[PDB]
Symmetry: D3
Subunit: 133 residues, 6 copies
């Protein structure tokens, strides 16, 4: 029914949490449709991915972070996959992310937060085309 | 103090999640008082269990599902066991079930949702008598 | 395709390791074909089960232990299930049971050793007829 | 940025949940700054720790409980560590503690609830000085 | 420092064990240097990969199985990675694979055995050039 | 009933495996009788602990590593605790440590190997007096 774009971020690799994160999505019965490993993502790709954040004070630090180690980009498929994976992901802010969520259990920074997931049907299409042209 | 009726549903067997589900209840320190394995539950038993749903459009599909593989029926005992296990179970709807709950972590369908737990003292008594006459 | 008889012993209930043990077998892709919960196993069934030990110095303590809490009797089905589950179980002696096995990881006593598994085709048939006549 | 005081309570030792609890805090990327194992904490220490509860009907039972087995006292450090660990801990009341939290997943009593964490900056300072003078 | 080629086989996807298998390797501190997801591996790549088996009785079934679902091809890097991952993998024969190994804990069939790993430096070079030319 | 001395080494803190290692021992039903956290172990204690290695080529690197981060010193108690925990620990050489063991599953270096355990009754007495005089 729906396809969403997930990024396993460089901090997941540094902290050896790649399997842990992918395992939480896998156990929810979401199916991998496409996947790519990036040893270092091109900065331009990152900048496109986060285009809506270009005027934010953290934009450059964010881009630096996202190129600092490997990323895995994954297209997951399932009924209402976009909203469901967003709820598994958890809130951006470590003051709010709920225990039981990926970020709530594992992330302790607003920036180094392990995982990206598309937030809407519109943005899922855009992001899938970025990472899987 | 309280006794509640839990069903491990056929999807749990298919997806090899029986131990995972029982383990979550066990780690919460609830005690098994009775347990029965059903290779295939009798349809009539299922129909009685879900009698309140007989006029629903999904009733037949639900009954078909519940006889499609094995079920384990368990009576768990503990202080406020009925409400506590309901909260561990999670919401029926995969749009609502919270990460950290059984359904929130593991279920991705409104129908194939791994687990039944009694919703009240009144229904616990009824269901216990159905599965353990 | 073989059937084997497994008992989850009273120490597993005491230490809340029931799901942990069943999980290890389930993950190995073995299927439950029968299962019974015993709040307290009748002494005669225990003495029949361990009849080969009836003249050993530890027989009375063994029987006492086996009726000291609940047990689950499970028939598991799989290709070469008997030997495979015996290998998962691990050695009776905690000085010999290998890490990775159920007893090697979890048990620390020659007597309170969490799990029984049939040791041959013939003993399997006998034990199945005892717990599931 | 912040330091908070955690107690692993005697029930965690009895139920073999020490690692499980510490593991949840560790995976959130909080750093141990100080740690002490108490075979049995002095009653006076407990009474100081829970001074605000001296006029409560459960005070004596609580103190009895807290000296009934070992405690580990830990100072954890991290950005907003006090509130973050409180959220991981979960509500005191087993009717309210959320699945995904330490208490929500593992505790089933209002009193025997596995873990203490400081509730404010003010109380963190007081408790750290009690356990680590 | 060596590179080895690992395949996550179609049975791992069917049984939702992809993260479980990758997790065991990740926890051993091995680093992904390349990775590809194959919705369906092309038959020619499979037949090249298993070319040494082309005249065996099981070749056709093997190839059929290997294209029956998705696979992930991973190049892992680490000191003595080849032999170390082979030891984690465990024996092909489910009567021989040790508990603690990937196959020993998880696989129950000589053919559907979850994971491939290069068996030598030379076979590693060959397999890497096949999946990552 | 024996007591053994365990050290959780600095690589365990770096890789966030402290609870994982302690968990494996706790699950084997061993009891903590003493424990100390060392933000940085004093060099003299390290050199005393590894005094048998003082003339080895790796002594300086070993000592450097052992003071490069925090360590926990634990005295564990159990029947045949010394040999049993040594078997859980696994071989020093990552080419020899068996899957299922702590080092076999988690360590990938001869030097950064996560855990020390006393190797005999006599070395246990010596190490206990060093870390807990
Ligand atoms: N330092 C910092 N980084 C931020 C902040 N807000 C967002 N970011 C970074 O920008 C990324 C995108 O932000 P957003 O779409 O709002 O959050 P997400 O969808 O939860 O990842 C986040 O993953 C953060 O790493 C902030 O307030 N401070
Ligand atoms: N397909 C479908 N099935 C439903 C729906 N509502 C309930 N069911 C099924 O009927 C069962 C009983 O419903 P209910 O008592 O409301 O939910 P539960 O107590 O959370 O299991 C559920 O477990 C579902 O499998 C629905 O809207 N659609
Ligand atoms: N105390 C004691 N108990 C024993 C001994 N040998 C066997 N037992 C007990 O008797 C049970 C059956 O023994 P056996 O069939 O040889 O071992 P198992 O198949 O590995 O459980 C074991 O599970 C032990 O609990 C012994 O030497 N000492
Ligand atoms: N029996 C009982 N014990 C309580 C109650 N409220 C608090 N306690 C105990 O007193 C301790 C301190 O209470 P409090 O600071 O409010 O809760 P906490 O910070 O969540 O541990 C708790 O951990 C409980 O063990 C109660 O209503 N009944
Ligand atoms: N049915 C069957 N399949 C086999 C046999 N031997 C090998 N295979 C299959 O061929 C694949 C490659 O064999 P091999 O290189 O010897 O084993 P591996 O490196 O442990 O996977 C194995 O993974 C099996 O799936 C056999 O005797 N019978
Ligand atoms: N680099 C290096 N370090 C070693 C060697 N042998 C021992 N060590 C280090 O010295 C420590 C003590 O050695 P030993 O008592 O033999 O091994 P252990 O009891 O298994 O830790 C080990 O944990 C290693 O970190 C070696 O051959 N090379
Ligand atoms: Mg976003
Ligand atoms: Mg209901
Ligand atoms: Mg036997
Ligand atoms: Mg408080
Ligand atoms: Mg091979
Ligand atoms: Mg040594």
């Amino acid at each position: 029914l729906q396809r969403t774009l997930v990024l396993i971020k460089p901090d997941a690799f540094e902290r050896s949490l790649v399997a842990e994160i992918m395992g939480r999505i896998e156990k929810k019965n979401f199916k991998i449709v496409s996947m790519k490993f990036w040893s270092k993502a091109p900065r331009n790709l990152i900048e496109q991915h986060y285009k809506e954040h270009s005027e934010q004070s953290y934009f450059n630090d964010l881009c630096d972070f996202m190129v600092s180690g490997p990323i895995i980009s994954i297209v997951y498929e399932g009924t209402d996959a976009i909203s469901k994976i967003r709820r598994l992901q958890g809130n951006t802010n470590p003051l709010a992310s709920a225990p039981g969520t990926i970020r709530g259990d594992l992330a302790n920074d607003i920036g180094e937060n392990l995982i990206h997931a598309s937030d809407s049907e519109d943005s899922a299409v855009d992001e899938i085309s970025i990472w899987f042209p």
